[PDB]
A paper describes a structure:
[name], encoded by [name] and formerly known as [name], [name], [name], or [name], is specifically expressed on the basolateral membrane of hepatocytes. [name] plays a vital role in mediating the uptake of endogenous compounds such as bile acids, bilirubin, steroid conjugates, and thyroid hormones, as well as a large variety of clinical drugs including statins, antibiotics, antivirals, and anticancer medications for hepatic clearance. The overall architecture of [name] is composed of the transmembrane domain (TMD) and extracellular loops (ELs) with both N- and C-terminal ends situated in the cytoplasm. The interface between NTD and CTD of [name] forms a conserved cavity in which substrates bind.
We determined the structures of [name]-apo/B/S/D in outward-open state at resolutions ranging from 2.9 Å to 3.7 Å. Structures of [name] bound with bilirubin, simeprevir and DCF, adopt similar outward-open conformations as that of [name]-apo. The root mean square deviation between [name]-apo and each of the ligand-bound states is 0.51 Å (apo vs bilirubin), 0.46 Å (apo vs simeprevir), and 0.89 Å (apo vs DCF), respectively. In outward-open [name]-apo/B/S/D, the intracellular gate is closed mainly by TM4 and TM10. A conserved salt bridge is formed by the interaction between D198 and K568. Additionally, multiple hydrophobic residues act as barriers, blocking the intracellular central pathway. Particularly, the ICH is attached to the C-terminus of TM2 through hydrophobic interactions between F325 and aromatic residues, F83, Y86 and F87. This attachment potentially contributes to the sealing and maintenance of the intracellular gate in the outward state. MD simulations support the stable existence of both D198–K568 salt bridge and Y86–F325 hydrophobic interaction in outward-open [name]-apo/B/S/D.
Residue numbers in the entry: 25 to 123, 137 to 144, 154 to 279, 323 to 651
Write the structure that this text describes.
């Protein structure tokens, strides 16, 4: 086996690391309710893993490479597991979680105090922050160091094949993040301690929390086990300055920073896109997309390793091949622009309550007679779809005199608004929920998903290339640093900032906002279909088009150099 042994543990540590990222995300929403921690802190808690990993990555990489490489990664894994267990710990030392609106037509400081009053000098929130961040350090030596081992110790071109195999087997991590994470979400937090016949809260219930303790246990004990095979297996400034003074490398990391930022933004906002533009709430879509996506992405990465090795591509050749994927992954995006639908008809926001006129400003659409008398709470977002094909903000704002009730039929009757002038024979009724989007888009949505899958395959076929190219354009001794600085740049400036600035441009387009407590903009009830599609796709295509321009310069630069 030889190197294959190291490859075997490296695959195992990749599984552990990737499982670690998804498990925290799965429990991030569940953890807030039981812990009774502030949402702000909840974010700050996620910032913890980031600071761990991001803060020490540029050090572990550079310094670690001189030291024994098969042993250090092992420690990194052992740290990952310890952090996970430690994060599970509060449950061992804490107590049992003791803890309409028909809206038809008619004639936080506490939680914070709860979080703080119970502290009694030291609250449990510090344990989660002190522990999770540990996992970040555990992730630090997996990429910049382990890859620096295989790359330096491998066949002439197999490095590509091995790197493809690792990145295709690490996709089993999510696959095991969604089989147990959802399953263990179903299990109560104090399972085994309390008799589960008395717990009233249900997995669908808001009060119910997910079992964060078992969830981190599965991850910590997996990482600790994964670390067992590894054991058996003034210069800094200058290096950082030297890699940064390399013209080809800086262009390449800038290029990758821009592309990844675009891709990360696209990956995180596809679910708002599935829901807003076409109408799939994404509950069904996420499952369907996930089932198709994981095998196809893994096949894409595997083909990437195989093509590189089989064709015996050199640095310029892989640069070109990478660009080829860059052209193939952007030509597909151009097709998204053609796919856009028209806007959803929302009374009081995009159209008048009588349905006669489009509205230019969603600020202060006057009540129409049909809704003027109703003393309605304008803020409430309880959308009901009328038989006229027009959504209404609430049953009250639709003029619905009566509603069906707590019973299953969702129809609301005698709605003053939406009455079709001239056609009084037909009687009104507004089923709950937003109106479905028109069928042209529904047919189009499948095409959108198909092209998406094609783009994901054609961007995973060049996923292996991103790391493979970096090692070749950097000096044969500062390789570990390279995969560390770059791994920082992908995450610090692009992974951390992707949702923050994509979100902002997207946020401006919202027709309506949710007034959450003091905040009047807590959420967006509905994104304008035309504006959101125009900016989200535009931003993604623009960043990607800039990337192509860099590639051309990058490829021209290597061709001139060689
Ligand atoms: C819609 O409104 C009309 C007019 O208010 C309702 O008409 C009366 O409804 C009750 C029960 O049927 C009774 O007062 C009479 O049988 C109806 N005629 C009138 C005008 O008194 C009607 O029930 C409402 N529901 C609909 C039409 O779906
Ligand atoms: C409305 O009309 C339908 C027939 O189109 C009828 O079945 C239903 O009972 C009516 N409901 C009321 C009370 O308007």
């Amino acid at each position: 086996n030889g190197l294959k042994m190291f490859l075997a543990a490296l695959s195992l540590s990749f599984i552990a690391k990737t499982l670690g990222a998804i498990i925290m995300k799965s429990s991030i929403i569940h953890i807030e309710r039981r812990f009774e921690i502030s949402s702000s802190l909840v974010g700050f808690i996620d910032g913890s893993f980031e600071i761990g990993n991001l803060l020490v990555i540029v050090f572990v990489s550079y310094f670690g490479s001189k030291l024994h490489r098969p042993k250090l990664i092992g420690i990194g894994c052992f740290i990952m597991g310890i952090g996970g267990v430690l994060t599970a710990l509060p449950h061992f030392f804490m107590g049992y979680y003791r803890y309409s609106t028909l809206s038809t037509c008619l004639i936080s400081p506490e939680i914070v105090g709860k979080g703080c009053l119970k502290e009694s000098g030291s609250y449990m929130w510090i344990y989660v922050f002190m522990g999770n961040m540990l996992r970040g350090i555990g992730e630090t030596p997996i990429v910049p160091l382990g890859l620096s081992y295989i790359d330096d110790f491998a066949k002439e071109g197999h490095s590509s094949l091995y790197l493809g195999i690792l990145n295709a087997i690490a996709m089993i991590g999510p696959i095991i993040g969604f089989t147990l994470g959802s399953l263990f979400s179903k299990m109560y937090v104090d399972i085994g301690y309390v008799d589960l016949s008395t717990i009233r809260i249900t997995p669908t219930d808001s009060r119910w929390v997910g079992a964060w303790w078992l969830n981190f246990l599965v991850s910590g004990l997996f990482s600790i086990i994964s670390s067992i095979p590894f054991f058996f297996l003034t210069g800094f400034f200058q290096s950082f300055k030297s890699i940064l003074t390399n013209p080809l490398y800086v262009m390449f990391v800038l290029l990758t920073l821009l592309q990844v930022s675009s891709y990360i933004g696209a990956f995180t906002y596809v679910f708002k896109y599935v829901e807003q533009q076409y109408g799939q709430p994404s509950s069904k879509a996420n499952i369907l997309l996930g089932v198709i996506t994981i095998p196809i992405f893994a096949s894409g990465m595997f083909l990437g390793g195989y093509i590189i090795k089989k064709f015996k591509l050199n640095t310029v050749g892989i640069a070109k091949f990478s660009c080829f994927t860059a052209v193939m992954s952007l030509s597909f995006y151009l097709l998204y622009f053609f796919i856009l639908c028209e806007n959803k008809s929302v009374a009081g926001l995009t159209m008048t309550y009588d349905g006669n006129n489009p509205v230019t400003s969603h600020r202060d659409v006057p009540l129409s007679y049909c809704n003027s008398d109703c003393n309605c709470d304008e803020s409430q977002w309880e959308p009901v779809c009328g038989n006229n094909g027009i959504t209404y903000i609430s049953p009250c704002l639709a003029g619905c005199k009566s509603s069906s009730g707590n019973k299953k039929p969702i129809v609301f009757y005698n709605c003053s608004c939406l009455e079709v002038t001239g056609l009084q024979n037909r009687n009104y009724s507004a089923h709950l929920g937003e109106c479905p989007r028109d069928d042209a888009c529904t047919r189009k949505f499948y095409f959108f998903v198909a092209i998406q899958v094609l783009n994901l395959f054609f961007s995973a076929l060049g996923g292996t290339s991103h790391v493979m190219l970096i090692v070749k354009i950097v000096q044969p001794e500062l390789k570990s640093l390279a995969l560390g600085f770059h791994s920082m740049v992908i995450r610090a400036l692009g992974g951390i900032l992707a949702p923050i600035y994509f979100g902002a441009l997207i946020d401006t387009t919202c027709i309506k906002w949710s007034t959450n407590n003091c905040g009047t903009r807590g959420s967006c009830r509905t994104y304008n279909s035309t504006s959101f599609s125009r900016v989200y796709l535009g931003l993604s295509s623009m960043l990607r088009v800039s990337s192509l321009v860099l590639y051309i310069i990058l490829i021209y630069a290597m061709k001139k150099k060689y």
